Amino acid sequence: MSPILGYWKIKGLVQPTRLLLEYLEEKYEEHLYERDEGDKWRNKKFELGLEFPNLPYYIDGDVKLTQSMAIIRYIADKHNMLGGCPKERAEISMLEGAVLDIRYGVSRIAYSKDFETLKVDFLSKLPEMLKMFEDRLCHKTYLNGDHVTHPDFMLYDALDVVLYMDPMCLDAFPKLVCFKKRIEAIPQIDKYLKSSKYIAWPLQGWQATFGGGDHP
Amino acid sequence: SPILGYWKIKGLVQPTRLLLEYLEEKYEEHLYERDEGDKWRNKKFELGLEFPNLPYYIDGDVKLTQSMAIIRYIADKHNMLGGCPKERAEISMLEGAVLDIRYGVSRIAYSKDFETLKVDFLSKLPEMLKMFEDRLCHKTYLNGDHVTHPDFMLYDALDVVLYMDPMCLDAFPKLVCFKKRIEAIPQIDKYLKSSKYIAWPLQGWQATFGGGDHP
Ligand SMILES: O=C(O)[C@H](Cc1ccc(Cl)cc1)Cn1c(-c2ccc(Cl)s2)nc2ccc(-c3ccccc3-c3nnn[nH]3)cc2c1=O
Numbered sequence: 001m002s003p004i005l006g007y008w009k010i011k012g013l014v015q016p017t018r019l020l021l022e023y024l025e026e027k028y029e030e031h032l033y034e035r036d037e038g039d040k041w042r043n044k045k046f047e048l049g050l051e052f053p054n055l056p057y058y059i060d061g062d063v064k065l066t067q068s069m070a071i072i073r074y075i076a077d078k079h080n081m082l083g084g085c086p087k088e089r090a091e092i093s094m095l096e097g098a099v100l101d102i103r104y105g106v107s108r109i110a111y112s113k114d115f116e117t118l119k120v121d122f123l124s125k126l127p128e129m130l131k132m133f134e135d136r137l138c139h140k141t142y143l144n145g146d147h148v149t150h151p152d153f154m155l156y157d158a159l160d161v162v163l164y165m166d167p168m169c170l171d172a173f174p175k176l177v178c179f180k181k182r183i184e185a186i187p188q189i190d191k192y193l194k195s196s197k198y199i200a201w202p203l204q205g206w207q208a209t210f211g212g213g214d215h216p
Numbered sequence: 217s218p219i220l221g222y223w224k225i226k227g228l229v230q231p232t233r234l235l236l237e238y239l240e241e242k243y244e245e246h247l248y249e250r251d252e253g254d255k256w257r258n259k260k261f262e263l264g265l266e267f268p269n270l271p272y273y274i275d276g277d278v279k280l281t282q283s284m285a286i287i288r289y290i291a292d293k294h295n296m297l298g299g300c301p302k303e304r305a306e307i308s309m310l311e312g313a314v315l316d317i318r319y320g321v322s323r324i325a326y327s328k329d330f331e332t333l334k335v336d337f338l339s340k341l342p343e344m345l346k347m348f349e350d351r352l353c354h355k356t357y358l359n360g361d362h363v364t365h366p367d368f369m370l371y372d373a374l375d376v377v378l379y380m381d382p383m384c385l386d387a388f389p390k391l392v393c394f395k396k397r398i399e400a401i402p403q404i405d406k407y408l409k410s411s412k413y414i415a416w417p418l419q420g421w422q423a424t425f426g427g428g429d430h431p
Pocket residue numbers: 008010012013034035036038104107108109111203204205206207208212323
């Protein structure tokens with residue numbers, strides 16, 4: 001019985017997890033909730049044995065999880081990708097948190113009616129945040145060096161989202177532009193992005209001020 | 217001796233301080249005051265940090281930023297993250313569910329519309345609290361008989377939501393008892409009555425909620 005990954009039919013909180021599963025060639029099935037399927041979720045929400053019912057959820061023959069970060073880390077942990085010692089695990093959690101500062105920075109203003117205003121403050125800080133990853137990639141192919149880790153897929157998703165908010169945000173960051181193309185050049189990722197399983201849009205929920213709507 | 221650098225506020229690092237106090241580990245704090253933002257900007261890129269930010273954690277083995285990497289590093293050095301992928305995922309799920317509450321406060325704490333956003337937040341908060349109340353039905357702490365780092369994160373979230381509404385836990389007796397139980401841990405009690413405890417601010421001095429020099 002393959003694992004089940006449940007979420008809205010958006011990129012949202014789960015997109016890096018989908019990319020990690022595809023990179024690892026892990027079989028999984030999805031429960032997808034469309035824009036008019038809130039009732040289908042409410043009817044299912046307390047029938048999965050989840051201790052903290054929420055979207056996304058991940059169910060296999062061992063665990064029944066919620067919290068997107070617990071889920072992506074669980075998949076990485078099963079593949080010995082979280083780090084071999086406290087120092088390496090901390091480096092990976094620091095990369096993870098620095099990516100979340102960008103991704104959550106988008107989300108925390110995406111549902112406000114006055115998104116346009118708060119977007120200015122976020123975009124004034126975005127370059128300094130991106131510069132830290134540009135520098136990290138100065139002598140590393142991926143965020144943790146020679147091999148892919150789950151924060152690479154988190155960073156890839158963050159770049160995809162911020163490029164919709166500001167199509168020029170990577171004009172000063174050639175290593176980040178190259179990094180994004182490098183992730184797209186991973187055979188598993190390329191196959192996934194060109195597949196029927198890929199959800200291009202929306203980025204946030206359908207009613208969000210930014211990253212919403214049925215189409216870009 | 218580790219150095220924990222942060223604003224002289226509870227903020228992102230308060231659960232980390234509580235965990236260090238619970239474990240009785242020595243550490244030095246480099247606290248940045250209300251008018252010291254310039255001093256931080258001037259040194260930010262000279263500390264050997266890969267992702268300069270507040271809080272930072274400097275010890276003989278690592279130079280870290282991101283509050284969750286720091287708290288997990290301290291827990292990891294004490295073998296507290298979980299003994300297998302299933303247990304580690306349970307602990308990460310507990311931490312994420314606490315963060316939904318703590319960050320739900322931070323999301324609205326800087327808005328001029330905090331008073332209106334507070335109504336909506338306190339209306340959604342009981343559903344989040346109920347999951348923790350049920351978790352504590354047959355558990356002393358969030359992961360059973362022994363303390364884990366999400367217990368100090370939950371303690372901090374409860375401390376902060378009680379400043380937003382002192383009666384928001386009255387229908388959640390297991391959460392009220394949990395908060396009291398954490399305060400009854402001798403090393404926590406000692407820390408809370410010490411000169412090292414920072415009671416306020418919660419979000420930074422200019423925040424609409426959890427700001428100002430005193431509560
Ligand atoms: O209330 C919540 O669940 C969140 C509150 C919240 C806002 C900001 C931040 Cl920093 C953290 C939490 C927002 N949210 C989310 C997502 C959050 C993050 C990311 Cl990334 S996505 N996904 C949604 C996904 C779907 C729906 C929804 C489903 C059916 C019909 C309409 C919607 C809808 N109505 N508003 N926008 N879309 C909602 C959310 C959503 O509110």
